[PDB]
C-alpha cells in the first residue's frame, strides 16, 4: 500500500 | 579539486571509491521526481587557484543503486538535464577558486506509479556516480567513483502525487466515539485520483477491519472507515476527482463497528492500507 493507517481505540466498561 | 559534505566532512579525492553520506529530501516535480539535490550536499574547491584550473564531468554509467537500481530518470548537471543512467559524458564544471562551490548535481526519477513510494533508510545506497577530473595544464585525466548514501530516512515518491504522511496513527475516543483521519494527497500537476483500502476484515460487508490489538483485546468490535458518512469497504475504489498542487483530503473518519456477539472491554487496533490509482 501507499499509506499505512494504524487506528487505536479502547472499549471501556 | 577537493570536496566535503554539508556538515564539513572531507571526501577523499580519487583513487578508490568513496562512500559519501548526504541528506536528501525527495519530492514530486512536474514530469519527474527529485531523489536528491546534491548541490546542497557536496561542496568543492581548488587548492591552487593562482595556477591550476580543475574540470570535472559526470561519466557514462552513473546510475541509481540499491533499492532504486531498477529506476531511470534524469540528472541535472550544471544547469542542463541528461538521461540517467548516464549514456554520455556531461559537459564539465570548472573549479578555479579556493572558495567552496557546490557540485551542481540533482538526480531525478521517472514516475511509474500514481502515488507510490520507495523507502530509503539512512545508510542505504542511493546512486553510483562516476566522475572524471582533468585540468588546464597537463595530461592528468582520472576517473573515480562516488557511492552516494542516504544520511537520513526518506521515502522517494515514484508517482505523480505525494501524501501528507506514509504512516498515520490515529486514536479513537473511548467506544463508541469516532475520530477524523488526517491524510491528504497532492500532485505535481493535475491528476485524476482514486484510492482503495486494504486489510483484514471481520464482517459480511467487508468493511470492518479486524481488531488485532495484542494485549487485552476487546471482543465484538472492529474499525470501520467512512467518508462524509458513507462506509468505505475494503478494495472498493473511492474517487478524489482531480487533485492539483494543493492538498486534497481523503475525507476519512475512523469509527468502531460491531462484528457480532457481545462487545467486551479492551484494546482495539486495526492496520489499514491506502493505495492510490489514476482514474
Residue numbers in the entry:
A (entry chain B): 1 to 13
B (entry chain A): 1 to 279
Text of the article:
The adhesin FimH at the fimbrial tip specifically binds in a catch-bond mode to terminal α-D-linked mannoses of N-linked glycans of the receptor uroplakin 1a on urinary epithelial cells. FimH is a two-domain protein, composed of an N-terminal, mannoside-binding lectin domain (FimHL) and a C-terminal pilin domain (FimHP). FimHP possesses an incomplete immunoglobulin-like fold that is completed by insertion of an N-terminal donor strand of FimG, the subsequent subunit in pilus assembly. The two-domain architecture of FimH is a prerequisite for catch-bond formation because the interactions between FimHL and FimHP determine the conformational state and ligand-binding properties of FimHL.
The crystal structure of the binary complex FimHF18·DsG was determined at atomic resolution by molecular replacement. FimHF18·DsG comprises the jellyroll fold FimHL and the immunoglobulin-like FimHP domain complemented with the FimG donor strand. It closely resembles unliganded FimH in the fimbrial tip complex, with a root-mean-square deviation of Cα positions (Cα r.m.s.d.) of 1.1 Å. The DsG peptide in FimHF18·DsG is in identical position as compared with the N-terminal FimG extension in the fimbrial tip structure; it interacts with β-strand 2 and 9 of FimHP. All contacts in the FimHL–FimHP interdomain region 17 as well as the conformation of the empty ligand-binding pocket observed in FimH in the fimbrial tip are preserved in FimHF18·DsG. Thus, FimHF18·DsG represents the ligand-free state of fimbrial FimH, with Associated FimHL and FimHP (Afree state) and is an elegant minimal system to analyse the crosstalk between ligand-binding and interdomain interactions underlying the formation of catch-bonds by FimH. In the absence of ligands, FimH adopts the Afree state with associated FimHL and FimHP and an open conformation of the ligand-binding site, which is responsible for the 30-fold faster ligand-binding of full-length FimH as compared with the isolated FimHL domain. The results revealed equilibrium dissociation constants (Kd) of 3.6 and 9.9 μM for FimHK12·DsG and FimHF18·DsG, respectively. The rates of HM dissociation (koff) of 22 and 58 s−1 for FimHK12·DsG and FimHF18·DsG translate into dissociation half-lives of only 32 and 12 ms, respectively.
